Design an enzyme around this catalytic site. Structure first.
Site, PDB file in Angstrom:
ATOM      1  CB  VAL A   6     -23.353  23.464  10.342  1.00  0.00           C
ATOM      2  CG1 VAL A   6     -22.174  23.234   9.987  1.00  0.00           C
ATOM      3  CG2 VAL A   6     -23.832  22.547   9.315  1.00  0.00           C
TER       4      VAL A   6
ATOM      5  N   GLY B 272     -27.736  21.207   7.720  1.00  0.00           N
ATOM      6  CA  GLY B 272     -26.610  20.331   6.568  1.00  0.00           C
ATOM      7  C   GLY B 272     -27.899  19.226   6.595  1.00  0.00           C
TER       8      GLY B 272
ATOM      9  CG  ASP C 149     -10.911  30.971   7.393  1.00  0.00           C
ATOM     10  OD1 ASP C 149     -11.672  31.578   8.608  1.00  0.00           O
ATOM     11  OD2 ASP C 149      -9.959  30.633   7.076  1.00  0.00           O
TER      12      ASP C 149
ATOM     13  CG  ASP D  55     -23.314  14.708  -1.449  1.00  0.00           C
ATOM     14  OD1 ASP D  55     -23.652  15.086  -2.367  1.00  0.00           O
ATOM     15  OD2 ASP D  55     -23.893  15.246  -0.130  1.00  0.00           O
TER      16      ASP D  55
ATOM     17  CE1 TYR E  38     -24.929  14.369   9.193  1.00  0.00           C
ATOM     18  CE2 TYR E  38     -25.535  15.873  10.909  1.00  0.00           C
ATOM     19  CZ  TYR E  38     -24.932  14.846  10.197  1.00  0.00           C
ATOM     20  OH  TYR E  38     -23.352  15.205  10.336  1.00  0.00           O
TER      21      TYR E  38
ATOM     22  CG  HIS F  47     -15.701  50.011  -0.868  1.00  0.00           C
ATOM     23  ND1 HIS F  47     -15.649  51.096  -0.393  1.00  0.00           N
ATOM     24  CD2 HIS F  47     -14.755  50.683  -1.831  1.00  0.00           C
ATOM     25  CE1 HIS F  47     -14.143  52.279  -0.497  1.00  0.00           C
ATOM     26  NE2 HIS F  47     -14.163  51.691  -1.116  1.00  0.00           N
TER      27      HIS F  47
HETATM   28  C1  LIG Z   1     -21.438  20.549   5.346  1.00  0.00           C
HETATM   29  C2  LIG Z   1     -22.203  21.644   5.320  1.00  0.00           C
HETATM   30  C3  LIG Z   1     -21.929  23.172   4.491  1.00  0.00           C
HETATM   31  C4  LIG Z   1     -22.149  24.094   4.278  1.00  0.00           C
HETATM   32  O1  LIG Z   1     -21.590  25.036   3.849  1.00  0.00           O
HETATM   33  N1  LIG Z   1     -20.411  23.086   4.943  1.00  0.00           N
HETATM   34  C5  LIG Z   1     -18.987  24.616   5.941  1.00  0.00           C
HETATM   35  N2  LIG Z   1     -18.821  25.421   6.114  1.00  0.00           N
HETATM   36  C6  LIG Z   1     -18.003  25.381   6.331  1.00  0.00           C
HETATM   37  N3  LIG Z   1     -16.501  26.801   6.588  1.00  0.00           N
HETATM   38  C7  LIG Z   1     -17.192  27.613   5.513  1.00  0.00           C
HETATM   39  C8  LIG Z   1     -17.734  28.939   6.035  1.00  0.00           C
HETATM   40  C9  LIG Z   1     -19.261  28.797   5.407  1.00  0.00           C
HETATM   41  C10 LIG Z   1     -20.051  30.066   5.653  1.00  0.00           C
HETATM   42  C11 LIG Z   1     -20.083  30.665   6.381  1.00  0.00           C
HETATM   43  C12 LIG Z   1     -21.037  31.530   7.132  1.00  0.00           C
HETATM   44  C13 LIG Z   1     -20.192  32.434   7.467  1.00  0.00           C
HETATM   45  C14 LIG Z   1     -21.609  33.410   8.332  1.00  0.00           C
HETATM   46  C15 LIG Z   1     -22.633  34.220   7.506  1.00  0.00           C
HETATM   47  C16 LIG Z   1     -23.124  32.544   6.981  1.00  0.00           C
HETATM   48  N4  LIG Z   1     -22.056  30.761   6.434  1.00  0.00           N
HETATM   49  C17 LIG Z   1     -18.868  30.546   7.409  1.00  0.00           C
HETATM   50  C18 LIG Z   1     -17.876  29.399   7.147  1.00  0.00           C
HETATM   51  C19 LIG Z   1     -17.213  24.716   7.524  1.00  0.00           C
HETATM   52  N5  LIG Z   1     -16.362  24.412   8.039  1.00  0.00           N
HETATM   53  C20 LIG Z   1     -16.071  23.540   9.017  1.00  0.00           C
HETATM   54  N6  LIG Z   1     -17.378  22.705   8.393  1.00  0.00           N
HETATM   55  C21 LIG Z   1     -17.485  21.035   8.928  1.00  0.00           C
HETATM   56  C22 LIG Z   1     -17.582  20.347   7.744  1.00  0.00           C
HETATM   57  C23 LIG Z   1     -18.635  21.089  10.220  1.00  0.00           C
HETATM   58  C24 LIG Z   1     -18.223  23.526   7.236  1.00  0.00           C
HETATM   59  N7  LIG Z   1     -18.787  23.049   6.178  1.00  0.00           N
END
Ligand SMILES: CC[C@H](CO)Nc1nc(NCc2ccc(-c3ccccn3)cc2)c2ncn(C(C)C)c2n1
Lengths: 826, 248, 333
Positions: free
Chosen positions: C27, C22, C103, C145, C24, C326
Site C-alpha cells: 500500500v 497489504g 491520516d 475482519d 495481496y 520530546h
Molecule cells: C488496510 C491496509 C493498511 C494498513 O495500515 N491500512 C491503511 N492505512 C491508511 N492510512 C493511515 C496511515 C497509516 C500509516 C501511515 C504511514 C506513514 C508513514 C510511514 C508508514 N506508515 C500513513 C497513513 C490508509 N489510507 C487509505 N487506506 C486504504 C485502505 C488504502 C489506508 N489503509
C-alpha cells in the site's frame, strides 16, 4: 539473525526514592536510596552516611516503603516494580554474610485495567494491616499483611472517583482510613473512606469531602495528636480534620511549584518542603494546649531555610542533617542550622554525590590525542544544568562544569579547539514588559555575546499578548573552550525560538568549519511549529559571525553532515541541502513519507530515519538521480527516543517504553516486497530511557587488534544518568553466552525472586515478547562475583560447536578468563 | 459514477465484429454459441444460475468492445465463466473449466485454445476486466422475477406455472442481446407478461390492485407495453427458427 | 469518462512512499499529479499469481463500488502499470486500487501510546464505527475482519472502516456454508472458536465490543496465542459457554473438545466497573456469548451511550505531539 551484547558502564545515578527506618537492626537508623533498578542501604552516623550493602533488582523500583509489623523486632521492606512485581524483603546478616531474604513475593498485575495518570501509588496502613496500591483508575488494590499471605494475594475494591491525584493512610483512626485528593469536572476535592478487610469494601469516611485548590498535588497524613491531613497546592497549603479547617496562602510558595515533602519531628510539628527552584522551606504546625488536655492545631506557618538541589525526595536523618535526593542534579547531605549565616540562609552544603542526571546529549572526543576518548555530556536541567567530562581510570573520573541552565545538544569543533552547546534558560515576564532571569547562567555570563538580528519572521501580525509572571524559555548557542570550559561566546536566538539541532562541519568546496543550528518558532497557539531557521555560523577571533540563514516551514528536529551536504529534517520532511559557491544552502531533494522525522543517522549514502510513531526507515541517496529512495521500512508502530546504525545491515533503535530493538535488511531477493520489509530481529527490555546513541568507547584501544572479539562499540546516555554500551557478537559467541545466561539464572538468587527472563522480556502496555538476539552483559559480568562451587555447577556439561574448535566442556578457569575479557570493553 | 451497459437495437448493426466483415446472422450465431457454451460448461461444473448469467453478461458486454474475428468466442467464454466464479463467490479452478471445455467441444472447436489452454484463458483476464471497466456487480432477471411473483397472491398452482415458464424464458433470453438492451427488472416483467399471455392468466387479479390493468407498473414504473412486446417478440423468434414451440 | 476504470495509468500519481504491506500487495501513499489530492494505492499483482486476479481484490472491488457511506472507505478508481509492446500476453502488469488517503489507523495510535480518548471521544468514534457497520449489515454484508489496523481515522476525527478483502455476502433466507477461520484471534467471537461455519453478522459486533473495551483500557481485552487459550480468556470474563446461557452451544462441533478450565461465572460488569454505566451496558450487550442474544449494529446506535451523540459535533481525538515527551522532565511528570 542479529547478535548483540549490552552492558552497563555507569549505573543509574539519579535518585528516584529514599526512605528511613530500622531495616538492618532495631538500633541502627537506616537510609535506603533507590536509583531506578539499584537499591543502596546505608547506616546513619554522626559523621554522615556509612554504606552497608547495595543490590540490583530485575525490575524498575516503583514503590519502596519500610514498615514494622506486629511481632517483628526490626523493619521489613516492601518493593513493587514497574512490571507489577511485589515483594517483602528482610535484611539478615550472619557475621560478614549480608543477604536480602525474600519473605513474600508475587506479580500484582490485573487482567483488565487502565493505568493511572499520576502513576503507581503505594501506601501502608499505620497499624500494618494492609498495603494499599493504586495501580489502575477506579480500582484500589489491597494486599492484607497477614502471616499466611506469602504469595501476596490481593483484592480490588471498586473506587467511585476515577481520576485520583494522591492518596495516604490517615493516623489516629478506629478503622484503617484512606484520604485522597481527586479530580472531576467540578474541580479538585479531598475525600475519605474506611477500608474494611473483613467485608472487602469501602465504608463511609470519618470526615466530609471538601472542595480544594485546582492544583492540589500532595496529601500528607499527620500523626497524632493532630490526625487529619495537609494538602499542598501551587498557591496554598490547607489542613483538614473534619470540623477543623485551616488555610494559608503565603506569597513565597506561589513563585515556584512545591514538588516534595517530609516529616521532621515524629509528632508532626515540623515538615520540610522542597520546590522546583531548589528552595527548601519548613512548614511549622503551631499547637494550642486546650484545658481539656488535647492539643488543637492553632495555625500553619512557612519559613524559607535556603537553597538546595532540585529535590525529587527529601528525607531528614537526624540533627540538622538532611538527604536531598535529586533527580535533575547532584544529590546532597545538607546541615540545617538554628542560626542563619551572613547570606540569611540556614542551609550549609556538607557533601555532594555526583548525579549525571538526565543525559540529554553527548559526544566522544579525544582532548589529549590518546586513542581512548572522553565523553562530554549535556547533563541536568534548570539550575542543575552542567556538562560532565567522563574518562576511564578502577573508577570513572568525572569533571563537572556547572552552567546553571538546561543544556540541549553538544558537538565538538576541533578546528576551533572548542565545543558548541545549545542551552535554554527560563526568564519570567516582568513589569517592564520584557523578561528577567531568576539567576545568572552560562549564557548571561559569556565573555562576548550576541543576539540574532534576523528579520525573516518580520511583523508576523501574531496576537501573542502575555501576562506577568509567565515563564518563557530563552535559547542560546554557547561556545565553550575544550580545556578550560570557559564560556567564550553566547549567541541568543530570536524571541520564542527554540534551538533543536546542532552540527559542526565543512560543506561543499567551502574550507571553513561552520556551526549550523536548526530552530523552530514555538508559540503556545501552534499545535506543531510552522516556521524555523537553519542558521550557519562561523566561530573565528573569539566571535560568531552569521554566514547564512535558510527559512523553513516547520521545526528542524535533526541535522547531519552527509557527504559534504547538509541533511536536515523539517517536521514530516527529510531534506538534503547543498552549500553553493555563493555561501547559501539550496535544496537538492526531499522525502515526505513521515509522521514526524525526529532522528537522523547516516552511513555512506544510507540514512536511518527515526520517526515519532512509525518506527525507523532506511532511505538512500541515489547519486545518479539526485533524489532519495526508500530501501526498507519497519512496519511496527514504535514511539522512538533515539536511533543508530550498527553496520550496513543492522540498525539499533530505542523506544519510549524502555525497550531496545535491532532491525536488519531482509537480504532475500525472491520478491521486491520482502526486500522492503525491515524485520525486528533483536528485542530487549533495557529498563532505561535512552536519549542519545553515540559511536565510540572510553577504553584504551592499542595500535593493533586487541581486547574481546566483540566488534563495534556504541555508548548511550539515559534519563537516569546510566551510561551503557552496545556491541556486536559472532554467532558462536552469542550461542555460548546465551547458554551461560540460562545456567547463570538457575544459580543466581534474585532479589524478590523475580524471573530474569521476565524482566528483560520486551514490554509495552499492549505487547510483551521474550527478549531475543541480546545478551545481558550485567548478568554475564556477575559470574565473577559468585562462589567457586556455584561456578563449577554452571560450567558442568557445557558443549560449544562450530567456532573452529572441538566440543571442549568449559571449566571454571575457561569462563573466568572469557568473562574477565568481556569486562575490559568498558 | 457507474458505466452505462445498455444499447439500442440499431447500435448492434455497428459492433466491431459487424464492421469487420461479419454479417448480422453470423454475429447472432456466435452470441448463442458462446452463451450456450458458458451455460453448458458451468452447468456441468455444478454452478449457481447467477454465476452462469454473470459470465454470459460479461461475454455479451465483451463482444460490444471487441470482434469475434480477433477473439475466439469459446476462449473468451471460458474466461468469462472463470472470472464470474470468483465474482459470485462460487470459484472453480481454471484447469477444471479447461477440462470441461475440451469435453464439450470437438477438435476443431478446441483448436481456438491453442497449445496452452489455461494460459490462453488466464492471459485474457486482464483484457476482460479492463473491457467490463471493473463493473463486476451484475443483477439478473431471476431475482426480480422471484421478488415480483412472491407478491402475487392467488392459486398456488397457476402462479407456480407462470414462475416456472417465465424462468425458462429468462434462460433463453441469455442467448440474446436483450441483456445488453434492457434492465433485468424490465426483462423479469417481460417474461412474466409473456408467460401470462401464453397461459391466458390475468396477472392483475393476483396483485394488490386487481382493478389495475397494467399490473407491471407496480413493479417497474415507466415501462410501456410496446417495450414488453418487443422483448416478447425477440424471445419467441428463438422458438420460431426451430422446434420447442411454447409448451404447457 | 469518470465511470471508465482501469484505463488511466498509475504514472499520473506521484508516489510518496510505502505505508504498509497489504493482503495481496503493498500500500503506497501518493499524490494525484493533476488535482494534488492525496491517495492510498493498494497494489494488486496478478503476474506472479495462479488463478489470475485474486478473489480478495475482486471482493473488495465488488463490495466497495456497492457501498457508499461516510464511515466506510472510498475506492476512487483503478489504474494500471504502463502498457507496452501492444501484446496483452507479454503484459505482466499490475493494477492499483486508488483510495481516499487517511491520516492514521487505530492500531498505530494505540501502539505508540500517543493518544488519549475521553468519554466524548469514544462516543464520537463508536457512533461512526457502528453507523458504518450498520450500513454494511443492512446491505447484507459481513466484514469478517474487524481489527484495530482496519479502523482508519483521519485528523478531522472521522472514522472509516476498511480492508473488505475478507468480506462476504450473507443470505438470512436458508443457510450458506462459510469459512470458520475469520478475524484475528484477539477480536474473534466464541461461536467461531467453537467451530461455527453458518454464522451471522453478530460476529462483527463481537469485534466491535472488543474495540470498545479496548478504547477504555488502551490494551486489547483478550490477548492469547491459540484458540483454546483465547476461549479461556473470553470464558474468564463473559462466563463459560454453556446451554444455561447459550442453548444452541451444544450444536457446535468443538463444544465438547474445547472446554474451559472451570465453569466461570460472568464477571464483565465487575471487571469493567471503572467504565461509565451507559458504555458498560453497551459493552455487556456487545460481548454476549450466544450470538442470537447479542445485540445488532442498529441496536448499538439506539443505546443510551450512542443514540444522543451529536452527528455535527465530531470532537477530534487529541494526539499530543511535538511539545509532548520530546523533553518531559518535572514540568511534564
Ligand atoms: C488496510 C491496509 C493498511 C494498513 O495500515 N491500512 C491503511 N492505512 C491508511 N492510512 C493511515 C496511515 C497509516 C500509516 C501511515 C504511514 C506513514 C508513514 C510511514 C508508514 N506508515 C500513513 C497513513 C490508509 N489510507 C487509505 N487506506 C486504504 C485502505 C488504502 C489506508 N489503509
Amino acid at each position: 539473525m542479529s547478535y548483540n551484547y549490552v552492558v552497563t558502564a555507569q549505573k543509574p545515578t539519579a535518585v528516584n526514592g529514599c526512605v528511613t527506618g530500622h531495616f538492618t537492626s532495631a538500633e541502627d537508623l537506616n537510609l535506603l536510596i533507590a536509583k531506578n533498578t539499584r537499591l543502596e542501604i546505608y547506616v546513619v552516623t554522626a559523621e554522615g552516611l556509612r554504606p552497608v550493602k547495595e543490590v540490583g533488582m530485575y525490575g524498575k523500583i516503583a514503590v519502596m516503603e519500610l514498615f514494622r509489623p506486629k511481632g517483628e523486632s526490626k523493619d521489613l521492606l516492601f518493593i513493587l516494580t514497574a512490571k507489577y512485581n511485589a515483594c517483602i524483603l528482610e535484611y539478615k546478616q550472619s557475621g560478614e554474610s549480608i543477604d536480602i531474604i525474600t519473605r513474600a513475593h508475587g506479580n500484582v498485575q490485573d487482567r483488565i485495567g487502565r493505568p493511572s495518570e499520576t502513576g503507581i501509588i503505594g501506601i501502608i496502613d499505620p497499624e500494618c494491616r494492609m498495603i494499599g496500591l493504586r495501580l489502575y483508575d477506579g480500582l484500589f488494590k489491597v494486599i492484607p499483611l497477614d502471616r499466611d499471605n506469602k504469595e501476596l494475594k490481593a483484592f480490588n475494591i471498586r473506587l467511585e472517583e476515577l481520576h485520583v491525584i494522591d492518596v495516604k493512610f490517615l493516623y489516629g483512626c478506629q478503622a484503617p482510613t484512606i484520604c485522597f485528593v481527586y479530580q472531576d469536572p467540578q474541580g479538585r476535592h479531598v475525600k475519605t473512606y474506611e477500608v474494611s478487610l473483613r467485608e472487602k469494601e469501602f465504608n463511609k469516611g470519618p470526615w466530609k469531602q471538601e472542595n480544594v485548590e485546582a492544583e492540589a498535588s500532595m496529601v500528607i497524613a499527620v500523626p497524632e495528636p493532630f490526625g487529619g491531613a495537609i494538602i499542598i497546592g501551587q498557591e496554598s497549603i490547607t489542613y483538614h480534620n473534619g470540623d477543623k479547617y485551616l488555610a494559608i496562602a503565603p506569597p513565597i510558595i506561589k513563585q515556584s511549584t512545591i514538588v516534595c515533602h517530609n516529616r521532621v519531628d515524629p509528632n508532626g510539628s515540623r515538615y520540610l518542603l522542597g520546590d522546583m527552584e531548589g528552595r527548601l522551606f519548613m512548614l511549622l504546625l503551631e499547637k494550642e494546649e486546650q484545658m481539656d488536655g488535647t492539643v488543637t492545631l492553632k495555625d500553619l506557618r512557612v519559613e524559607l531555610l535556603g537553597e538546595t538541589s532540585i529535590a525529587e525526595c527529601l528525607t531528614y536523618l537526624d540533627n540538622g542533617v538532611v538527604f536531598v535526593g535529586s533527580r535533575l542534579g547532584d544529590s546532597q547531605l545538607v546541615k540545617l542550622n538554628v542560626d542563619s549565616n551572613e547570606q540569611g540562609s540556614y542551609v550549609v552544603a556538607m557533601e555532594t554525590f555526583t548525579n549525571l542526571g538526565p543525559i540529554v546529549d553527548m559526544c566522544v572526543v579525544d582532548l589529549e590525542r590518546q586513542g581512548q576518548g572522553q565523553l562530554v555530556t549535556c547533563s541536568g536541567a534548570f539550575k542543575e544544568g552542567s556538562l560532565r567530562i567522563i574518562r576511564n581510570g578502577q573508577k570513572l573520573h568525572i569533571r563537572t562544569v556547572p552552567l546553571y541552565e538546561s543544556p540541549r545538544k553538544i558537538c565538538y569543533q576541533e578546528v576551533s579547539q572548542c565545543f558548541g552547546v545549545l542551552s535554554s534558560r527560563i526568564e519570567v515576564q516582568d513589569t517592564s514588559g520584557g523578561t528577567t532571569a531568576l539567576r545568572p547562567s552560562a549564557s548571561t555570563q559569556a565573555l562576548s555575546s550576541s543576539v540574532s538580528s534576523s528579520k525573516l519572521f518580520s511583523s508576523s501580525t501574531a496576537p501573542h499578548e502575555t501576562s506577568f509572571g509567565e515563564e518563557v524559555e530563552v535559547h542560546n548557542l554557547l561556545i565553550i573552550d575544550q580545556h578550560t570550559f570557559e564560556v567564550l561566546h553566547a549567541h541568543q536566538f530570536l524571541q520564542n525560538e527554540y534551538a533543536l539541532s546542532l552540527v559542526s562541519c565543512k560543506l561543499g568546496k567551502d574550507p571553513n568549519t561552520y556551526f549550523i543550528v536548526g530552530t523552530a518558532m514555538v508559540y503556545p497557539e501552534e499545535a506543531e511549529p510552522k516556521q524555523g531557521r537553519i542558521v550557519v555560523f562561523q566561530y573565528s577571533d573569539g566571535k560568531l559571525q552569521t554566514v547564512a540563514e535558510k527559512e523553513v516551514k516547520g521545526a528542524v528536529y535533526s541535522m547531519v553532515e552527509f557527504n559534504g551536504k547538509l541533511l536536515a529534517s523539517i517536521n514530516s520532511t527529510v531534506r538534503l541541502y547543498e552549500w553553493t559557491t555563493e555561501k547559501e544552502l539550496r535544496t537538492e531533494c526531499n522525502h515526505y513519507n513521515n509522521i514526524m522525522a525526529l532522528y537522523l543517522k547516516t552511513k555512506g549514502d544510507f540514512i536511518l530515519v527515526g520517526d515519532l510513531m512509525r518506527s525507523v526507515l532506511l532511505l538512500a541517496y541515489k547519486p545518479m538521480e539526485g533524489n532519495f529512495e526508500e530501501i526498507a521500512r519497519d512496519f511496527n508502530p514504535n514511539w522512538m527516543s533515539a536511533v543508530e546504525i550498527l553496520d550496513d545491515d543492522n540498525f539499533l533503535g530505542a523506544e519510549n517504553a524502555f525497550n531496545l530493538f535491532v532491525c536488519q535488511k531482509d537480504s532475500a531477493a525472491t520478491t521486491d516486497e520482502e526486500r522492503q520489509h525491515l524485520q525486528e530481529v533483536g528485542l530487549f527490555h533495557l529498563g532505561e530511557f535512552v536519549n542519545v546513541f553515540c559511536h565510540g568507547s572510553l577504553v584504551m584501544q592499542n595500535l593493533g587488534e586487541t581486547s574481546t572479539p566483540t566488534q563495534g562499540s556504541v555508548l548511550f546516555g539515559t534519563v537516569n544518568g546510566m551510561i551503557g554500551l552496545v556491541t556486536s557478537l559472532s554467532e558462536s559467541w552469542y550461542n555460548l553466552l546465551l547458554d551461560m545466561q540460562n545456567r547463570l539464572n538457575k544459580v543466581i538468587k534474585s532479589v524478590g525472586k523475580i524471573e530474569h527472563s521476565f524482566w528483560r522480556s520486551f514490554h509495552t502496555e499492549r505487547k510483551t515478547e521474550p527478549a531475543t538476539g541480546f545478551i545481558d552483559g550485567d548478568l554475564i559480568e556477575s559470574f565473577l562475583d559468585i562462589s567457586r562451587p556455584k561456578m563449577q555447577e554452571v560450567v558442568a556439561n557445557l558443549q560449544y560447536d562450530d567456532g573452529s574448535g572441538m566440543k571442549r566442556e568449559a571449566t571454571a578457569d575457561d569462563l573466568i578468563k572469557v568473562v574477565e575479557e568481556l569486562t575490559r570493553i568498558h | 459514477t457507474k458505466p452505462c451497459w445498455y444499447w439500442d437495437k440499431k447500435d448492434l448493426a455497428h459492433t466491431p465484429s459487424q464492421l469487420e466483415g461479419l454479417d448480422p446472422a453470423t454475429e447472432a450465431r456466435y452470441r448463442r454459441e458462446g452463451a450456450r457454451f458458458i451455460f453448458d460448461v458451468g452447468t456441468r461444473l455444478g454452478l449457481h444460475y447467477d454465476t452462469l448469467a454473470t459470465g454470459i453478461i460479461y461475454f455479451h458486454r465483451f463482444y460490444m468492445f471487441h470482434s469475434f474475428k480477433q477473439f475466439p468466442r469459446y476462449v473468451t467464454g471460458a474466461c468469462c465463466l472463470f472470472l464470474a466464479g470468483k465474482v459470485e463467490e462460487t470459484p472453480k479452478k481454471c484447469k477444471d473449466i479447461i477440462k470441461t471445455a475440451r469435453s464439450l467441444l470437438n477438435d476443431v472447436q478446441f483448436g481456438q485454445f491453442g497449445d496452452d489452454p489455461k494460459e490462453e484463458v488466464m492471459v485474457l483476464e486482464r483484457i476482460l476486466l479492463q473491457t467490463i471497466k471493473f463493473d463486476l456487480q451484475v443483477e439478473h432477471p431471476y431475482q426480480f422475477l422471484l421478488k415480483y411473483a412472491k407478491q402475487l397472491k392467488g392459486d398456488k398452482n397457476k402462479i407456480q406455472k407462470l414462475v416456472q415458464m417465465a424462468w425458462t424464458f429468462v434462460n433463453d433470453s441469455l442467448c440474446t442481446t436483450l441483456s445488453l438492451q434492457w434492465e433485468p427488472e424490465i426483462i423479469a416483467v417481460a417474461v412474466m407478461y409473456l408467460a401470462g399471455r401464453l397461459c391466458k392468466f390475468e396477472i392483475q387479479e393476483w396483485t394488490s390492485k386487481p382493478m389495475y390493468r397494467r399490473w407491471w407498473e407496480q413493479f417497474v414504473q415507466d415501462v410501456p407495453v410496446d417495450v414488453l412486446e418487443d422483448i416478447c417478440h425477440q424471445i419467441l423468434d428463438l422458438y420460431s427458427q426451430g422446434k420447442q414451440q411454447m409448451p404447457h | 469518462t469518470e465511470s471508465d476504470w482501469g484505463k488511466r495509468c498509475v504514472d499520473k500519481f506521484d508516489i510518496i512512499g510505502i505505508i504498509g504491506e497489504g493482503t495481496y500487495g503493498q500500500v503506497y501513499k501518493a499524490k494525484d499529479k493533476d488535482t494534488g489530492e492525496l491517495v492510498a494505492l493498494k497494489k494488486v499483482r496478478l503476474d506472479n499469481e495462479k488463478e489470475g486476479f485474486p478473489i480478495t481484490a475482486i471482493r473488495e472491488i465488488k463490495i466497495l463500488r456497492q457501498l457508499i457511506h461516510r464511515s466506510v472507505v472510498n475506492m476512487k478508481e483503478i489504474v494500471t502499470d504502463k502498457q507496452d509492446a501492444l501484446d496483452f500476453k507479454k503484459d505482466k502488469g499490475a493494477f492499483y486500487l486508488v483510495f481516499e488517503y487517511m491520516d492514521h489507523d487505530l492500531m498505530g495510535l494505540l501502539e505508540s501510546g500517543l493518544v488519549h480518548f475521553s468519554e466524548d471521544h469514544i462516543k464520537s468514534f463508536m457512533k461512526q464505527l457502528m453507523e458504518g457497520l450498520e450500513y454494511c449489515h443492512k446491505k447484507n454484508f459481513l466484514h469478517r475482519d474487524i481489527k484495530c489496523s482496519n479502523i482508519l481515522l483521519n485528523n478531522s476525527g472521522q472514522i472509516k472502516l476498511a480492508d473488505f478483502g475478507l468480506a462476504r455476502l450473507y443470505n438470512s433466507e436458508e443457510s450458506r456454508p462459510y469459512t470458520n477461520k475469520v478475524i484475528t484471534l484477539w477480536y474473534r467471537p466464541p461461536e467461531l472458536l467453537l467451530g461455527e461455519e453458518r454464522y451471522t453478522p453478530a460476529i462483527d459486533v463481537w469485534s466491535c465490543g472488543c474495540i470498545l473495551g479496548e478504547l477504555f483500557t488502551k490494551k486489547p481485552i483478550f490477548q492469547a496465542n491459540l484458540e483454546l487459550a483465547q476461549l479461556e480468556l473470553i470464558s474468564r470474563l463473559c462466563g463459560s459457554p454453556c446451554p444455561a446461557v447459550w442453548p444452541d452451544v451444544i450444536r457446535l462441533p468443538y463444544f465438547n473438545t474445547m472446554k474451559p478450565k472451570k465453569q466461570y461465572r460472568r464477571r464483565l460488569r465487575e471487571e469493567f466497573s471503572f467504565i461509565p454505566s451507559a458504555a458498560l451496558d453497551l459493552l455487556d450487550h456487545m460481548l454476549t456469548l450466544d450470538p442470537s442474544k447479542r445485540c445488532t449494529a442498529e441496536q448499538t446506535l439506539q443505546s443510551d451511550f450512542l443514540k444522543d451523540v451529536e452527528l455535527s459535533k465530531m470532537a477530534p481525538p487529541d494526539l499530543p505531539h511535538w511539545q509532548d515527551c520530546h523533553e518531559l522532565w518535572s514540568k511534564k511528570r
